[PDB]
């Protein structure tokens, strides 16, 4: 029935998210300007992602138990999950009204063509939009949204993970917190198979991560493009 601890965890994650996600998107002004004219959107989105990586890291540090992991394991989980959590957290600005990420203003409203102008092909973009649509359809409570991002970050099967046993215990605690929350706090019919559908989204993310990595390597392949990214992005995305 959601123990004191599980309610504590949810409270920590909600505040953690509130401290790392500014719905006013005021900081977007610091990013190199978006250019909607080849790769004209790369500088702007690169900065957006670099900013987003910084936010995801801040969120992750506040995940109950994440601090108990080794420095190396913490690094491994962030490198592998960063793109996934950014895709997940972006659902908050994504709007089905026109299938775009609406970040406050027209300048900061991105659609398929903008992602296209960042160096990506439809093979990533379509399933990415598809993902956003399916996640939006779940109409998750904010409690479920933050729990899913935390569960994504603390995955024991990530390549390079060392104390896989420790990662699991941390994640299981967050999973059991989510499962129980859905039962006791998410009324039917919306709760129908909600947990299973959310886990399926993590599977979709693994697929998106894999395809993003391939197109990132093609893009970052040529120094002229790799030159337009940020140092944090270069370090995290390989």
């Amino acid at each position: 029935k959601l123990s004191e601890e599980q309610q504590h965890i949810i409270a920590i994650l909600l505040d953690a998210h509130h401290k790392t996600y500014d719905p006013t998107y005021a900081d977007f002004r610091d990013f190199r300007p978006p250019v909607r004219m080849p790769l004209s959107m790369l500088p702007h989105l690169a900065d957006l992602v670099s900013y987003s990586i910084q936010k995801v890291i801040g969120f992750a540090k506040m995940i109950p138990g994440f601090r108990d992991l080794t420095s190396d394991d913490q690094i491994v989980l962030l490198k592998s999950s960063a793109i996934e959590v950014i895709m997940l957290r972006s659902n908050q600005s994504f709007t089905m009204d026109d299938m775009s990420w609406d970040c406050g203003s027209q300048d900061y409203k991105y659609d398929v063509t903008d992602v296209s102008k960042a160096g990506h092909t439809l093979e990533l973009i379509e399933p990415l939009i598809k993902f956003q649509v399916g996640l939006k359809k779940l109409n998750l409570h904010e409690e479920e949204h933050v729990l899913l991002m935390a569960i994504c970050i603390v995955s024991p099967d990530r390549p390079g993970v060392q104390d896989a046993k420790l990662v699991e215990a941390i994640q299981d605690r967050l999973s059991n917190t989510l499962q129980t929350y859905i039962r006791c706090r998410h009324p039917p019919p919306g709760s129908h198979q909600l947990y299973a559908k959310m886990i399926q989204k993590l599977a979709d993310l693994r697929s998106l991560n894999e395809e993003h990595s391939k197109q990132y390597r093609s893009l970052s392949f040529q120094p002229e493009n790799s030159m337009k990214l940020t140092p944090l992005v270069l370090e995290v995305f390989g």
Partner: peptide, 10 residues
């Protein structure tokens, strides 16, 4: 060898 990421996690 992840300077920046590690610094941000400290």
């Amino acid at each position: 060898n992840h300077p920046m990421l590690m610094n941000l996690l400290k």
